[PDB]
Amino acid sequence: LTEEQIAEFKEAFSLFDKDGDGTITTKELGTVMRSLGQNPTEAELQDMINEVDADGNGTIDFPEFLTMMARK
Amino acid sequence: DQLTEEQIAEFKEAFSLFDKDGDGTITTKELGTVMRSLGQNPTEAELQDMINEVDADGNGTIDFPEFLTMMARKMK
Ligand SMILES: [Mn+2]
Ligand SMILES: [Mn+2]
Ligand SMILES: [Mn+2]
Ligand SMILES: [Mn+2]
Ligand SMILES: [Mn+2]
Ligand SMILES: [Mn+2]
Ligand SMILES: [Zn+2]
Ligand SMILES: [Zn+2]
Ligand SMILES: [Zn+2]
Ligand SMILES: [Zn+2]
Structure with a gap:
């Protein structure tokens, strides 16, 4: 929601994109999310x-991640 | 099946295609x-x-010995 949150989401997402392709696996x-100090079941x-994985391929991009987080 | 010289040579050649600073390390x-340069297409x-498997220290960098033994394990 805030620029702070967006930058933090971006850094965490990128931190765990291990294959460096701009997506993360499920x-x-x-x-x-745990790296952002959250605890989803x-x-x-x-x-x-x-919800995020529209193309059903087991990965999600940053825009998808970001808007999912906004809805929560 | 123990690795052949051809296999080791190709794994080495492929690894080193992406080590342009020639220090024996590439990134994860x-x-x-x-893998794709070897004709493979891992999901x-x-x-x-x-x-x-290959970056057990998680510093984001990989050397050839660790890459090679991973390939040997993965072998068909
Ligand atoms: Mn990725
Ligand atoms: Mn997807
Ligand atoms: Mn390189
Ligand atoms: Mn280097
Ligand atoms: Mn290098
Ligand atoms: Mn490493
Ligand atoms: Zn990926
Ligand atoms: Zn739902
Ligand atoms: Zn997308
Ligand atoms: Zn090593």
Whole structure:
């Protein structure tokens, strides 16, 4: 929501994009969220995942991550 | 099956295609590209696993011995 939050989301997302392609895997998402000091359950995570991952390929880009976080 | 000289030579050649400063290290961000340069096409899940295996210290950089032994394990 704020510029602070956006920059922090961006840094965490990038920190865990291990293959450096601008996306993170669904597995990396839980870690990214814990790195932001949040604690989603698997149930929470998986719906989030199902919502962001439109093309259903197991990865999500930053715009998708960002808007998911905004809705929460 | 123990590695052949041809296999080791090709893994080395591919690794070193992406070590332009010639210090024997590449980044994990390049591992996928190395694999594709060998004609392979690891899925997002396979590459996640390989990156985990080869960068055990997580500093984001990989050397040839660690890359090679990963390939030997992965061998068909
Ligand atoms: Mn990625
Ligand atoms: Mn996707
Ligand atoms: Mn390079
Ligand atoms: Mn270097
Ligand atoms: Mn190097
Ligand atoms: Mn390393
Ligand atoms: Zn939902
Ligand atoms: Zn997208
Ligand atoms: Zn990826
Ligand atoms: Zn080493």
